[PDB]
Design a protein around this ligand. Sequence first.
Ligand SMILES: *[C@@H]1O[C@H](CO)[C@@H](O)[C@H](O)[C@H]1NC(C)=O
Ligand SMILES: *[C@@H]1O[C@H](CO)[C@@H](O)[C@H](O)[C@H]1NC(C)=O
Lengths: 48, 116
Amino acid sequence: EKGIYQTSNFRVQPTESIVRFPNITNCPFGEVFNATRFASVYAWNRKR
Amino acid sequence: VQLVESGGGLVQPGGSLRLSCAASDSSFYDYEMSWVRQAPGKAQEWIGSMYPSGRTYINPSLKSLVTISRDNSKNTLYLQLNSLRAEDTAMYYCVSNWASGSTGDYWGQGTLVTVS
Ligand SMILES: *[C@@H]1O[C@H](CO)[C@@H](O)[C@H](O)[C@H]1NC(C)=O
Ligand SMILES: *[C@@H]1O[C@H](CO)[C@@H](O)[C@H](O)[C@H]1NC(C)=O
């Protein structure tokens, strides 16, 4: 019959996703992996 | 970890190196520390020893190679050595109360000083 009827709903879907995280993208962990000369086998020095 | 040994490494024959041994406190020095090594065949002869009040005595016949110093800020130890030779073919230890056997002491890390 004549009138105005509320059928469904309208929602705006998003476009592509966006992720944002700070300036810190690394701290030089190379202090252990790549020294000039490496130590013994079982003198595992706890470089923390 | 009461005692930690600092520095050291492989030594080229005809080269020189310096050792270190950070100390937990001046109270554990009572009354004889140890810069002990394991020389090949040679008996266990003490090289570096010192006292909590700040004394120092060294073996007369083996003191032509070894020098000792300290700083009290970091409680770091200096063992400035010159003219390293083949009589050190082992890895060292800086352990308190070494002279009282091998059971009344805490073992840290130690460092290796060897040449060909
Ligand atoms: C964060 O580092 C600087 C801020 O000085 C900025 O110009 C840069 O765009 C950001 N770079 C990274 C890798 O986060
Ligand atoms: C260490 O290995 C190589 C250089 O030796 C280098 O490409 C690499 O980025 C280094 N990795 C770390 C964690 O230091």
